[PDB]
Amino acid sequence: MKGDTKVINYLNKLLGNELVAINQYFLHARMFKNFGLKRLNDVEYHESIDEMKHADRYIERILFLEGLPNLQDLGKLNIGEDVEEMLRSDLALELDGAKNLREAIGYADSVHDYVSRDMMIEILRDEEGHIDWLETELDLIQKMGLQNYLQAQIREEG
Amino acid sequence: MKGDTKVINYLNKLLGNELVAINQYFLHARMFKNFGLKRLNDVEYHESIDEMKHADRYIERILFLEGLPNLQDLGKLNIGEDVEEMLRSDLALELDGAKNLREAIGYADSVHDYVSRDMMIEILRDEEGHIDWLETELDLIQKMGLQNYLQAQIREEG
Amino acid sequence: MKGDTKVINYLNKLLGNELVAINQYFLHARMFKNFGLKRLNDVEYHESIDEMKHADRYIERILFLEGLPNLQDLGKLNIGEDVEEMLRSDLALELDGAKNLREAIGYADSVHDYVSRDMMIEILRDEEGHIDWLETELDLIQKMGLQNYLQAQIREEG
Amino acid sequence: MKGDTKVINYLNKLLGNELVAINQYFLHARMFKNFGLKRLNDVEYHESIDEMKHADRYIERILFLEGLPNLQDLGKLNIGEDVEEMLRSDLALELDGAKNLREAIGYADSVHDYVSRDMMIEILRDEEGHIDWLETELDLIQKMGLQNYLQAQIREEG
Amino acid sequence: MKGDTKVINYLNKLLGNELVAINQYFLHARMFKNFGLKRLNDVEYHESIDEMKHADRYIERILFLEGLPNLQDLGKLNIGEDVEEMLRSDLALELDGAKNLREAIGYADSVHDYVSRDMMIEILRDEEGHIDWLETELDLIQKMGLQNYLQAQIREEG
Amino acid sequence: MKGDTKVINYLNKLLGNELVAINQYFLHARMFKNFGLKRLNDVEYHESIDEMKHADRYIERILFLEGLPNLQDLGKLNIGEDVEEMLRSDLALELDGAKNLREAIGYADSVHDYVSRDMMIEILRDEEGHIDWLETELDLIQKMGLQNYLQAQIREEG
Amino acid sequence: MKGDTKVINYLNKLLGNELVAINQYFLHARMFKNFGLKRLNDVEYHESIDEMKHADRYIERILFLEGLPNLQDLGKLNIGEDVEEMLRSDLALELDGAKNLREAIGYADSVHDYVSRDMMIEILRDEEGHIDWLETELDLIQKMGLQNYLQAQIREEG
Ligand code: HEM
Ligand code: HEM
Ligand code: HEM
Ligand SMILES: [Fe+3]
Ligand SMILES: [Fe+3]
Ligand SMILES: [Fe+3]
Ligand SMILES: [Fe+3]
Ligand SMILES: [Fe+3]
Ligand SMILES: [Fe+3]
Ligand SMILES: [Fe+3]
């Protein structure tokens, strides 16, 4: 079914965001794993998978609407060296992505692509989940201090 | 994540509605139970639980959006003395709540708080369910008469 | 069965206490949950449920004794902003409620409402349990320090 | 263990009440059964059993306290001919028994027979249950009318 | 079905016997239990239940035949203070009851109430069982002596 | 929670009783075991455990009420040399303990420590159980004679 | 079998030690429990049980050897107010008991009471276990600091 061109550009832009997040989250995960912060590796890994699911959804939708998924261009990764910096970087990324999502959802509505919208609202809900988790972790770091925070990531959560 | 202030006020207003419904429905439930109308106790009870789930959702959302859930102010309960009056009171309440929900949903959309909107649409769908049930019961009372209606509430539905 | 009027007023006053505790405990629970203090969310939540059970018992008893349960008036919630302040607030509330209970129990005895008394003694025993738990948590905070206390609430207890 | 004499007289008086209720409830049960009111036979039967449990408890307690259980004297049965009259008769009996119980409980307390008291408070709680049930049935008869009430007792409750 | 009047009087007289036996056997049972004669408590208890079954059968039959079951008049209990005396008292009672049964059975036959007769013959067979048991126990007491007999009742029979 | 001082003294006095009973009952148990009176070892042992449960309850309660459990002072053990003397000694002890309990319960009531009272009433009920058992055994010894009584304690009760 | 008198005195002295440890360990356990140090309550409790097993063994042995177990005299409890002080007190007690055990074992050997010796060597092995555990805990307190040590006792070990 031929989709609205501008919806497809939004879908490709959002796909672009997911591609960045996939990599940044996966690297972060294995950095944590190397640091021995087993718990942060598990969560960040499961979030990389999450962004993969999102990418897949965009790709299928773009194809359905007869556009060309763009997996060629990769935006800026911001990696960082310590736990806080890395978490904070994931949060900034997630916030920029939520912004683009809000914009795309409004536009899809106005051209009546309600199923693209519906898909995007689900993804946004997932993003808001990641945002919640990140914000909480970052406050925990301040409230309990870095040393206690680190000790608390050593073992995986059952 | 800092939410839109006016969305938070709506969420607190809706939360306010749920708080009223929770109490009015619970009292009604146990009044029915005391009357020996076992079936009406079961349904109204399960609806009190339902409104609790709604309150919980608002509270979590307000907190997520960094507002202050207001559980302090309690609107007017209207209790009533006989079955019809009590059912009718629940229906009026549910109708005022649906009105506030319609208004909040429109507003959340226009400030792009799509996940608050999504949550609110689910809740509205639940409210419309309660409305359906209440309307039906009230017509049954007219069509079959109060005495038969009452006899029909004595045993619980399997 | 027509109960003693003053017993009913006591039951409504106690019900009043439970209504306050239900809300204060539920809000606290979800505040903790938002803070990421998973363990405190679980305990405070299970205490909100507890106070609900108490409210239900009063409501049923008032109805049985042919009084009018009052779910309309809601006393002062005191919420607070940090863990200690919130725990301490729950403790003060629980202490005022235990005071009213002691008074109601003595009175029910003197008008021979022994089953209302029996119910109230069970509830008091539950309250004393909450008091024990709160006092212990607050001392733990002093003995081990806030930072260690917080780290210790991150994971739920199996 | 030698008990207080007056406690034993109370226990025998209460036992006396149970003996009456046992018979009146059993006869009523089988009258209902004969009437084809299967549901009322089940409940009244289960209440006759209940009063038997009470009698047994008094008998064991009297023996323990070294008194002589009196199963020889039987108070006035009031049987009645139709459903309402019979239910109403059970209610009056249950009310006189609750009165004697309230009095015995106060006295046991003042001579420090706390375990006799504890037993009596449990029994009173059971009586208050029977009272609740009876009152409810009698109101149902008025609210839904005798004909509908009767139809509603034909089948047993699962 | 309207029964023969005199059959109904017999059924009420027999019912009267059962009512006496029910109480005398139950008291004896719990006296034994208090004495620590666990085995005699079990047997006498199971015989009280037995007489209850008999009473129930009479009550249902009287109602069926459209008479008025009489649970108001209670014949003489003879309780006794020691094991032998109490067993012997149960035996005398059981013997008087068998006498009335023999008489009632003959009469029911002559007015053709064969199903009342059939019921009564079953009950008589049960009574003869109790008689057998009682006689045996009483001879055991003589043959082995009271002290050995008592020791032999301490534990329940598997 | 700061308790009433005099309640705490009562709780320590009662705890004192349990401490005595624990030891006297345990020694008696193993004396019986040595005598080969397997059945008396089982019962007395299970009663020593029982008094331990009581001690534990007092200790926890005293601590809760912020007093100092006193396990230092041990009252007079009275051991005795033969079965009767030892049983009789347990009975006297149990009787003195019931006396102190009756007194403590009355006092707890008058200062409104209803949960301490509730706990104490449960314990009293247990004590009254031990008293019943002891009295029965001692009468069995008289009724069946010492030799038969002893033979009857050789095997354990299933 | 008549034992050596001096062995019996040793057994009574060792029994004396166990009696002290039983109480001191049980109180400590419930103090920890009250402090909310769930893990220390579990271990100290399981050590109180352990000392009970030891007492039982001495009591049975003394009886077997035809001496009089002495449960009347209770040595000095040293309770203490904070965790370290209490642990340290248990360690000193355990050390004095090991000393008496070493002495008793040597003596039992020289009078050829090899089975008393064998029993005592097993108990000593258990004591050495408690000593190991206590020493380790006390060093952990120094190495990780009191605050971290406390946090680490909050949850029970699976
Ligand atoms: C104020 C009067 C209220 C009464 C009398 C009441 C009563 C009850 C009762 C009896 C239960 C069942 C206990 C159980 O789950 O085992 C329950 C469950 C629950 N309540 Fe309330 N409640 C009240 C208010 C509230 C409020 C203000 C909230 C806040 C959101 C709330 C949230 C919940 C939740 C989430 C459940 C569990 C539902 C489930 O998973 O089945 N309740 N309530
Ligand atoms: C006097 C008229 C009575 C009638 C017609 C009657 C009838 C019955 C019947 C039909 C049963 C069921 C049989 C079964 O358990 O399988 C029963 C049970 C029982 N009865 Fe009676 N009864 C009478 C009086 C009494 C009295 C005076 C006592 C003395 C306490 C008593 C004590 C009991 C007890 C303890 C049970 C067993 C309850 C259970 O565990 O389910 N009954 N009765
Ligand atoms: C002082 C002489 C005592 C002796 C000889 C003794 C003996 C025993 C024995 C042999 C057991 C069974 C072990 C097991 O549970 O597997 C036991 C259990 C127990 N003891 Fe003691 N004990 C004594 C004092 C105490 C004291 C002072 C307390 C303090 C409250 C206490 C509290 C307990 C408790 C709570 C149990 C577990 C009961 C159960 O759950 O079955 N004991 N005791
Ligand atoms: Fe994504
Ligand atoms: Fe709702
Ligand atoms: Fe409460
Ligand atoms: Fe009763
Ligand atoms: Fe019979
Ligand atoms: Fe005790
Ligand atoms: Fe030891």
PDB file of N, CA and C in Angstrom, chain D residues 38-98:
ATOM      1  N   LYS D  38     -35.647 -26.403  49.823  1.00  0.00           N
ATOM      2  CA  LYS D  38     -34.383 -27.118  49.997  1.00  0.00           C
ATOM      3  C   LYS D  38     -33.283 -26.232  50.628  1.00  0.00           C
ATOM      4  N   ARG D  39     -33.267 -24.964  50.243  1.00  0.00           N
ATOM      5  CA  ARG D  39     -32.205 -24.035  50.629  1.00  0.00           C
ATOM      6  C   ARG D  39     -32.258 -23.672  52.093  1.00  0.00           C
ATOM      7  N   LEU D  40     -33.473 -23.549  52.601  1.00  0.00           N
ATOM      8  CA  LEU D  40     -33.705 -23.209  53.991  1.00  0.00           C
ATOM      9  C   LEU D  40     -33.440 -24.428  54.867  1.00  0.00           C
ATOM     10  N   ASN D  41     -33.714 -25.622  54.344  1.00  0.00           N
ATOM     11  CA  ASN D  41     -33.373 -26.828  55.073  1.00  0.00           C
ATOM     12  C   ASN D  41     -31.849 -26.883  55.247  1.00  0.00           C
ATOM     13  N   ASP D  42     -31.088 -26.588  54.185  1.00  0.00           N
ATOM     14  CA  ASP D  42     -29.622 -26.680  54.285  1.00  0.00           C
ATOM     15  C   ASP D  42     -29.090 -25.683  55.314  1.00  0.00           C
ATOM     16  N   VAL D  43     -29.505 -24.424  55.224  1.00  0.00           N
ATOM     17  CA  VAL D  43     -28.998 -23.434  56.156  1.00  0.00           C
ATOM     18  C   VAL D  43     -29.409 -23.749  57.598  1.00  0.00           C
ATOM     19  N   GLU D  44     -30.691 -24.049  57.835  1.00  0.00           N
ATOM     20  CA  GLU D  44     -31.157 -24.292  59.219  1.00  0.00           C
ATOM     21  C   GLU D  44     -30.548 -25.542  59.798  1.00  0.00           C
ATOM     22  N   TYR D  45     -30.386 -26.554  58.973  1.00  0.00           N
ATOM     23  CA  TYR D  45     -29.662 -27.714  59.404  1.00  0.00           C
ATOM     24  C   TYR D  45     -28.261 -27.356  59.858  1.00  0.00           C
ATOM     25  N   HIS D  46     -27.531 -26.596  59.042  1.00  0.00           N
ATOM     26  CA  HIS D  46     -26.144 -26.232  59.362  1.00  0.00           C
ATOM     27  C   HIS D  46     -26.061 -25.313  60.569  1.00  0.00           C
ATOM     28  N   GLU D  47     -27.188 -24.756  60.950  1.00  0.00           N
ATOM     29  CA  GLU D  47     -27.235 -24.033  62.133  1.00  0.00           C
ATOM     30  C   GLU D  47     -27.558 -24.800  63.358  1.00  0.00           C
ATOM     31  N   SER D  48     -28.382 -25.829  63.215  1.00  0.00           N
ATOM     32  CA  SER D  48     -28.541 -26.820  64.257  1.00  0.00           C
ATOM     33  C   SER D  48     -27.196 -27.487  64.656  1.00  0.00           C
ATOM     34  N   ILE D  49     -26.410 -27.890  63.662  1.00  0.00           N
ATOM     35  CA  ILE D  49     -25.066 -28.439  63.881  1.00  0.00           C
ATOM     36  C   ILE D  49     -24.226 -27.425  64.648  1.00  0.00           C
ATOM     37  N   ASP D  50     -24.363 -26.157  64.270  1.00  0.00           N
ATOM     38  CA  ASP D  50     -23.602 -25.115  64.896  1.00  0.00           C
ATOM     39  C   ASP D  50     -23.884 -25.030  66.397  1.00  0.00           C
ATOM     40  N   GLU D  51     -25.161 -25.102  66.749  1.00  0.00           N
ATOM     41  CA  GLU D  51     -25.565 -25.013  68.140  1.00  0.00           C
ATOM     42  C   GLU D  51     -25.137 -26.271  68.888  1.00  0.00           C
ATOM     43  N   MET D  52     -25.056 -27.385  68.181  1.00  0.00           N
ATOM     44  CA  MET D  52     -24.532 -28.597  68.791  1.00  0.00           C
ATOM     45  C   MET D  52     -23.083 -28.413  69.188  1.00  0.00           C
ATOM     46  N   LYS D  53     -22.291 -27.829  68.282  1.00  0.00           N
ATOM     47  CA  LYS D  53     -20.903 -27.514  68.580  1.00  0.00           C
ATOM     48  C   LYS D  53     -20.804 -26.623  69.826  1.00  0.00           C
ATOM     49  N   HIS D  54     -21.707 -25.662  69.951  1.00  0.00           N
ATOM     50  CA  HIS D  54     -21.719 -24.800  71.096  1.00  0.00           C
ATOM     51  C   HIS D  54     -22.033 -25.578  72.372  1.00  0.00           C
ATOM     52  N   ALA D  55     -23.088 -26.395  72.335  1.00  0.00           N
ATOM     53  CA  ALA D  55     -23.445 -27.218  73.491  1.00  0.00           C
ATOM     54  C   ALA D  55     -22.241 -28.065  73.944  1.00  0.00           C
ATOM     55  N   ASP D  56     -21.602 -28.726  72.984  1.00  0.00           N
ATOM     56  CA  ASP D  56     -20.469 -29.556  73.248  1.00  0.00           C
ATOM     57  C   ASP D  56     -19.415 -28.715  73.984  1.00  0.00           C
ATOM     58  N   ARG D  57     -19.158 -27.499  73.512  1.00  0.00           N
ATOM     59  CA  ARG D  57     -18.134 -26.698  74.141  1.00  0.00           C
ATOM     60  C   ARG D  57     -18.458 -26.357  75.592  1.00  0.00           C
ATOM     61  N   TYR D  58     -19.720 -26.038  75.857  1.00  0.00           N
ATOM     62  CA  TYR D  58     -20.153 -25.745  77.220  1.00  0.00           C
ATOM     63  C   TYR D  58     -19.996 -26.978  78.091  1.00  0.00           C
ATOM     64  N   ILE D  59     -20.430 -28.122  77.554  1.00  0.00           N
ATOM     65  CA  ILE D  59     -20.430 -29.368  78.325  1.00  0.00           C
ATOM     66  C   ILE D  59     -18.990 -29.693  78.744  1.00  0.00           C
ATOM     67  N   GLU D  60     -18.040 -29.499  77.834  1.00  0.00           N
ATOM     68  CA  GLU D  60     -16.673 -29.855  78.096  1.00  0.00           C
ATOM     69  C   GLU D  60     -16.066 -28.932  79.091  1.00  0.00           C
ATOM     70  N   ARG D  61     -16.445 -27.681  78.982  1.00  0.00           N
ATOM     71  CA  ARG D  61     -15.957 -26.644  79.874  1.00  0.00           C
ATOM     72  C   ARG D  61     -16.516 -26.856  81.287  1.00  0.00           C
ATOM     73  N   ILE D  62     -17.829 -27.124  81.398  1.00  0.00           N
ATOM     74  CA  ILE D  62     -18.439 -27.349  82.707  1.00  0.00           C
ATOM     75  C   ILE D  62     -17.731 -28.532  83.411  1.00  0.00           C
ATOM     76  N   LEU D  63     -17.501 -29.593  82.643  1.00  0.00           N
ATOM     77  CA  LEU D  63     -16.864 -30.782  83.163  1.00  0.00           C
ATOM     78  C   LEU D  63     -15.453 -30.421  83.588  1.00  0.00           C
ATOM     79  N   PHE D  64     -14.787 -29.609  82.779  1.00  0.00           N
ATOM     80  CA  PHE D  64     -13.427 -29.262  83.122  1.00  0.00           C
ATOM     81  C   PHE D  64     -13.406 -28.511  84.449  1.00  0.00           C
ATOM     82  N   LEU D  65     -14.340 -27.559  84.602  1.00  0.00           N
ATOM     83  CA  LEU D  65     -14.436 -26.739  85.801  1.00  0.00           C
ATOM     84  C   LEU D  65     -15.093 -27.496  86.945  1.00  0.00           C
ATOM     85  N   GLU D  66     -15.402 -28.769  86.712  1.00  0.00           N
ATOM     86  CA  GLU D  66     -15.913 -29.687  87.750  1.00  0.00           C
ATOM     87  C   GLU D  66     -17.365 -29.419  88.188  1.00  0.00           C
ATOM     88  N   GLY D  67     -18.174 -28.863  87.284  1.00  0.00           N
ATOM     89  CA  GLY D  67     -19.621 -28.733  87.512  1.00  0.00           C
ATOM     90  C   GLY D  67     -20.366 -29.874  86.827  1.00  0.00           C
ATOM     91  N   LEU D  68     -21.687 -29.845  86.970  1.00  0.00           N
ATOM     92  CA  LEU D  68     -22.575 -30.843  86.436  1.00  0.00           C
ATOM     93  C   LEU D  68     -23.358 -30.302  85.244  1.00  0.00           C
ATOM     94  N   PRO D  69     -22.995 -30.686  84.008  1.00  0.00           N
ATOM     95  CA  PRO D  69     -23.786 -30.184  82.880  1.00  0.00           C
ATOM     96  C   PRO D  69     -25.221 -30.633  83.013  1.00  0.00           C
ATOM     97  N   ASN D  70     -26.132 -29.699  82.761  1.00  0.00           N
ATOM     98  CA  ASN D  70     -27.550 -29.953  82.907  1.00  0.00           C
ATOM     99  C   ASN D  70     -28.170 -30.042  81.527  1.00  0.00           C
ATOM    100  N   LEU D  71     -28.467 -31.256  81.088  1.00  0.00           N
ATOM    101  CA  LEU D  71     -29.116 -31.468  79.815  1.00  0.00           C
ATOM    102  C   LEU D  71     -30.563 -31.919  80.068  1.00  0.00           C
ATOM    103  N   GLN D  72     -31.008 -31.783  81.317  1.00  0.00           N
ATOM    104  CA  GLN D  72     -32.298 -32.321  81.675  1.00  0.00           C
ATOM    105  C   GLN D  72     -33.397 -31.309  81.413  1.00  0.00           C
ATOM    106  N   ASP D  73     -33.142 -30.052  81.726  1.00  0.00           N
ATOM    107  CA  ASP D  73     -34.183 -29.043  81.577  1.00  0.00           C
ATOM    108  C   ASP D  73     -34.146 -28.424  80.185  1.00  0.00           C
ATOM    109  N   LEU D  74     -35.323 -28.351  79.568  1.00  0.00           N
ATOM    110  CA  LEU D  74     -35.444 -27.839  78.220  1.00  0.00           C
ATOM    111  C   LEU D  74     -36.415 -26.683  78.264  1.00  0.00           C
ATOM    112  N   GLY D  75     -35.944 -25.512  77.841  1.00  0.00           N
ATOM    113  CA  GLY D  75     -36.783 -24.305  77.808  1.00  0.00           C
ATOM    114  C   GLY D  75     -37.860 -24.398  76.748  1.00  0.00           C
ATOM    115  N   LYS D  76     -38.613 -23.307  76.594  1.00  0.00           N
ATOM    116  CA  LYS D  76     -39.725 -23.301  75.642  1.00  0.00           C
ATOM    117  C   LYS D  76     -39.276 -23.230  74.171  1.00  0.00           C
ATOM    118  N   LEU D  77     -39.673 -24.248  73.401  1.00  0.00           N
ATOM    119  CA  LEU D  77     -39.587 -24.197  71.945  1.00  0.00           C
ATOM    120  C   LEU D  77     -40.723 -23.337  71.454  1.00  0.00           C
ATOM    121  N   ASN D  78     -40.476 -22.479  70.460  1.00  0.00           N
ATOM    122  CA  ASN D  78     -41.602 -21.810  69.772  1.00  0.00           C
ATOM    123  C   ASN D  78     -41.465 -22.125  68.281  1.00  0.00           C
ATOM    124  N   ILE D  79     -42.362 -22.977  67.769  1.00  0.00           N
ATOM    125  CA  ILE D  79     -42.193 -23.564  66.446  1.00  0.00           C
ATOM    126  C   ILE D  79     -42.820 -22.725  65.314  1.00  0.00           C
ATOM    127  N   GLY D  80     -44.103 -22.431  65.409  1.00  0.00           N
ATOM    128  CA  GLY D  80     -44.691 -21.621  64.341  1.00  0.00           C
ATOM    129  C   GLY D  80     -45.065 -22.447  63.112  1.00  0.00           C
ATOM    130  N   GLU D  81     -45.884 -21.882  62.222  1.00  0.00           N
ATOM    131  CA  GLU D  81     -46.460 -22.713  61.176  1.00  0.00           C
ATOM    132  C   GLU D  81     -46.010 -22.356  59.778  1.00  0.00           C
ATOM    133  N   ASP D  82     -45.759 -21.067  59.518  1.00  0.00           N
ATOM    134  CA  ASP D  82     -45.265 -20.617  58.198  1.00  0.00           C
ATOM    135  C   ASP D  82     -43.842 -20.066  58.268  1.00  0.00           C
ATOM    136  N   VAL D  83     -43.177 -20.000  57.116  1.00  0.00           N
ATOM    137  CA  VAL D  83     -41.777 -19.569  56.997  1.00  0.00           C
ATOM    138  C   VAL D  83     -41.429 -18.326  57.808  1.00  0.00           C
ATOM    139  N   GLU D  84     -42.124 -17.218  57.570  1.00  0.00           N
ATOM    140  CA  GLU D  84     -41.812 -15.998  58.302  1.00  0.00           C
ATOM    141  C   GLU D  84     -41.868 -16.193  59.828  1.00  0.00           C
ATOM    142  N   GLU D  85     -42.967 -16.748  60.313  1.00  0.00           N
ATOM    143  CA  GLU D  85     -43.165 -16.966  61.717  1.00  0.00           C
ATOM    144  C   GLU D  85     -42.022 -17.821  62.253  1.00  0.00           C
ATOM    145  N   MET D  86     -41.582 -18.801  61.460  1.00  0.00           N
ATOM    146  CA  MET D  86     -40.561 -19.672  62.000  1.00  0.00           C
ATOM    147  C   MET D  86     -39.218 -18.987  62.031  1.00  0.00           C
ATOM    148  N   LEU D  87     -38.923 -18.210  61.004  1.00  0.00           N
ATOM    149  CA  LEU D  87     -37.665 -17.487  60.983  1.00  0.00           C
ATOM    150  C   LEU D  87     -37.627 -16.491  62.119  1.00  0.00           C
ATOM    151  N   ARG D  88     -38.745 -15.830  62.329  1.00  0.00           N
ATOM    152  CA  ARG D  88     -38.866 -14.771  63.313  1.00  0.00           C
ATOM    153  C   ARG D  88     -38.666 -15.359  64.705  1.00  0.00           C
ATOM    154  N   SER D  89     -39.149 -16.585  64.882  1.00  0.00           N
ATOM    155  CA  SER D  89     -39.016 -17.271  66.156  1.00  0.00           C
ATOM    156  C   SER D  89     -37.548 -17.608  66.461  1.00  0.00           C
ATOM    157  N   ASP D  90     -36.812 -18.050  65.437  1.00  0.00           N
ATOM    158  CA  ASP D  90     -35.402 -18.334  65.567  1.00  0.00           C
ATOM    159  C   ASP D  90     -34.658 -17.068  65.941  1.00  0.00           C
ATOM    160  N   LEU D  91     -35.016 -15.951  65.299  1.00  0.00           N
ATOM    161  CA  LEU D  91     -34.419 -14.637  65.605  1.00  0.00           C
ATOM    162  C   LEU D  91     -34.656 -14.198  67.055  1.00  0.00           C
ATOM    163  N   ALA D  92     -35.890 -14.277  67.546  1.00  0.00           N
ATOM    164  CA  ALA D  92     -36.156 -13.949  68.958  1.00  0.00           C
ATOM    165  C   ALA D  92     -35.308 -14.798  69.898  1.00  0.00           C
ATOM    166  N   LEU D  93     -35.113 -16.059  69.546  1.00  0.00           N
ATOM    167  CA  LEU D  93     -34.415 -16.978  70.440  1.00  0.00           C
ATOM    168  C   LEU D  93     -32.948 -16.623  70.526  1.00  0.00           C
ATOM    169  N   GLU D  94     -32.447 -16.231  69.376  1.00  0.00           N
ATOM    170  CA  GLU D  94     -31.055 -15.958  69.153  1.00  0.00           C
ATOM    171  C   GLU D  94     -30.714 -14.625  69.897  1.00  0.00           C
ATOM    172  N   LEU D  95     -31.629 -13.674  69.815  1.00  0.00           N
ATOM    173  CA  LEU D  95     -31.561 -12.462  70.582  1.00  0.00           C
ATOM    174  C   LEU D  95     -31.593 -12.668  72.111  1.00  0.00           C
ATOM    175  N   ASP D  96     -32.429 -13.571  72.622  1.00  0.00           N
ATOM    176  CA  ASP D  96     -32.391 -13.836  74.050  1.00  0.00           C
ATOM    177  C   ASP D  96     -31.099 -14.505  74.465  1.00  0.00           C
ATOM    178  N   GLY D  97     -30.579 -15.341  73.588  1.00  0.00           N
ATOM    179  CA  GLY D  97     -29.342 -16.011  73.886  1.00  0.00           C
ATOM    180  C   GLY D  97     -28.173 -15.043  73.866  1.00  0.00           C
ATOM    181  N   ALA D  98     -28.178 -14.086  72.936  1.00  0.00           N
ATOM    182  CA  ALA D  98     -27.091 -13.114  72.889  1.00  0.00           C
ATOM    183  C   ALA D  98     -27.072 -12.263  74.173  1.00  0.00           C
TER     184      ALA D  98
END
